[PDB]
Design a protein around this ligand. Structure first.
Ligand SMILES: CC(C)C[C@H](N)C(=O)O
Ligand SMILES: [Ca+2]
Ligand SMILES: [Zn+2]
Ligand SMILES: [Zn+2]
Length: 277
């Protein structure tokens, strides 16, 4: 797998920050900042050769969208999916929650095209809308997939908050194969990892997990406090939240730790290449 360039990931975050600033200060469901985010991501994917689909749904009286991108080729009966929610809360730009996961998945999708990669399994990427209203977009996608198509899903990888400013390195403890793939990557960098407990079933992997699709993912921490033991293994500040700007107006471009964002973006590409062989 390729090394994902941190500068390219940060460039997507800068574009999402500008879109929020030009649209009222946020990228929330039912507000212009969300559709403008979808448009930026879709344009990059269409230029790289992906087949893109906009799935529309209505929640809380407003139209939301999911963006689904399929890389042509691969085994249609074994699909590997990776995704991230693209909406923010209305209090701010949502750069770490979840511009960080959205940008890492977008750059990995662009890396597949730049590399001319032809995977054995078919690759599909998704950006979910309305996750902040209760996983509405990912629930809509799973509820609308016929059972014949659900059985073709080999796994779903989720990236939701992967650039926290005072980070931890947490790996989901769901499917064992996906979990091991991420743990082995971090072992090679000599970065320890811990099992994800803070989020639980509170992100877009839940609807997939509930219907039997193997799931996994990465997380760097939100409102919980980093312990002394955690600061010893990862650096940062003990006694302070992993993300002091969670759901706040200060979740902006300065609310990102570059080392964590780079390591998690690289880990995402490593898992996507490894599991699609
Ligand atoms: C609980 C954490 C993984 C983040 C949560 N899913 C959110 O979007 O706020
Ligand atoms: Ca990198
Ligand atoms: Zn989130
Ligand atoms: Zn959130």
């Amino acid at each position: 797998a390729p090394d994902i360039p941190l500068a390219n990931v940060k460039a997507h975050l800068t574009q999402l920050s500008t879109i929020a600033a030009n649209n009222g200060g946020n990228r929330a469901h039912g507000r212009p900042g969300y559709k403008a985010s979808v448009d930026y991501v879709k344009a990059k994917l269409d230029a790289a050769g992906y087949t893109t689909t906009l799935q529309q749904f209505t929640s809380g009286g407003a139209t939301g969208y999911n963006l689904i991108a399929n890389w042509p080729g691969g085994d249609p009966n074994k699909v590997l999916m990776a995704g991230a929610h693209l909406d923010s809360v209305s209090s701010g730009a949502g750069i770490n929650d979840n511009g960080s996961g959205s940008a890492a998945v977008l750059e990995t999708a662009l890396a597949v095209s730049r590399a001319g990669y032809q995977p054995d399994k078919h690759l599909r990427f998704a950006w979910w809308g309305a996750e902040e209203l209760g996983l509405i977009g990912s629930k809509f996608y799973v509820n609308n997939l016929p059972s014949a198509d659900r059985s073709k899903l080999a796994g779903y990888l989720n990236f939701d908050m992967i650039g926290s400013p005072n980070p931890g390195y947490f790996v989901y403890d769901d499917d064992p194969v996906i979990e091991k793939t991420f743990k082995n990557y971090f072992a090679g960098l000599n970065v320890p990892t811990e099992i994800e407990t803070e989020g639980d079933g509170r992100s877009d992997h839940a609807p997939f997990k509930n219907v039997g699709v193997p799931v996994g993912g990465l997380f760097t921490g939100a409102g919980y406090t980093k312990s002394a033991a955690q600061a010893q293994k990862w650096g940062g500040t003990a006694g302070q939240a992993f993300d002091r700007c969670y759901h706040s107006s200060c979740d902006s471009l300065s609310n990102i730790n570059d080392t964590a964002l780079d390591r998690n973006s690289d880990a995402a590409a490593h898992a996507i290449w490894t599991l699609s062989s």
